[PDB]
Amino acid sequence: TARYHTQMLRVREFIRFHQIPNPLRQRLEEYFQHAWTYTNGIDMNSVLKGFPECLQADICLHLNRNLLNNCSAFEAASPGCLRALSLKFKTTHAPPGDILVHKGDVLTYLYFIARGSIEILKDDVVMAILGKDDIFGENPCIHSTLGKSNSNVKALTYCDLHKIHRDDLLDVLDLFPEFYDSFVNSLEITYNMRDEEQ
Question: b/e for 176-192, b at 16 or more Cβ within 10 A?
């Protein structure tokens, strides 16, 4: 079922949806020919993950530069600080029908919607969020305690999401504490998920 050409063209559609440098684009293609699995066909991120350390790095790096280079919260980050961020940011492709966060869950990640449409539900739909580059979660830099969700988060369509872990974010501000004012001031959480009725 999972023949070479099948996988060859999913790969083609990644670079597709994610406008990718040729210097890497060729390196990935050459790695996928000189290696590919009939079993681990990887509808999405399976053998996509199965690549050597080197190549997955530039991807994350390039995917992150997207958010980092255009979102206004990161206006003002020193290149040192940007490098730190672009290193600890993660990217996730969510399939329609999928719960990123549940009602109690600790607010562990902060999310930026690249593409697609998220629904946030409290038993029923309290809001619809999108790759306007909407942001949901809490800003860990302002609260002394760790928040808890207050709601559920489903992918309505397929979604691209940039997520950073609070401690990575906190660590970055520890190293570049001078970024704190502009970040606190420029970060526009679209849907605040901190349960403030708890």
Answer: beebeeebeeebebbbe
Per DSSP, the three-state class of 145 is coil
Domain locations along the chain? 1-51, 52-197
For domain 52-197, the CATH class is mainly beta
Q: Which residues pair with 160 in a beta bridge?
A: 93, 115
Q: What is the resolution of this structure in A?
A: 2.5
CA dist 154 and 96 (Å) reads 8
Angle formed at CA 87 by CA 162 and CA 28, multiple of 5 degrees: 80
Exposed/middle/buried for residue 159 (C-beta within 10 Å: 0-12, 13-18, 19+): buried
Three-class DSSP category at 62: helix
Q: Degrees (nearest 5) of the Cα angle 10, 100, 124?
A: 120
Residue with tokens 């390039």: 62
Q: What residue ranges in 13-116 does DSSP mark as E strands?
A: 90-94, 99-101, 109-115
Strand 152-155 and strand 159-165: the pairing is unpaired
Classify residue 106 by its DSSP letter: B
Method: X-ray
99-101/117-121 β-pairing: unpaired
